[PDB]
Amino acid sequence: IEAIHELVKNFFQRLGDRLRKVDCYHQVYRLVGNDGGIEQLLRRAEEDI
Amino acid sequence: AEEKYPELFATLANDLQPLCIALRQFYLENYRQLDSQPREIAAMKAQE
């Protein structure tokens, strides 16, 4: 259990860090004023997993 | 004078978004975190 928590936590943070550089993430943020709920959904999914 | 010149500003804004995006996210998380805590003394005292 202890190691699994670290594994999941490291993966999600790395996914998020690299997701903010691709065009798709900032093209929408360019088009609208909000993130669109990516972080809220991403956080909720991570906890459930 | 009409194509390359404006592109310099266009790329500048594209290179500024990656950091302006993080500052907004960081402040909102901290700001909304504090609002969760109660404000009135009566509610705060009961929590203790």
Partner: peptide
């Protein structure tokens, strides 16, 4: 101010902050 400066020539807007609530 940055957005206003670019408003004259380019349409690439930035991300503002308002009504945090």
């Amino acid at each position: 101010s940055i957005n206003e400066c670019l408003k004259a020539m380019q349409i690439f807007e930035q991300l503002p902050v308002i009504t945090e609530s």
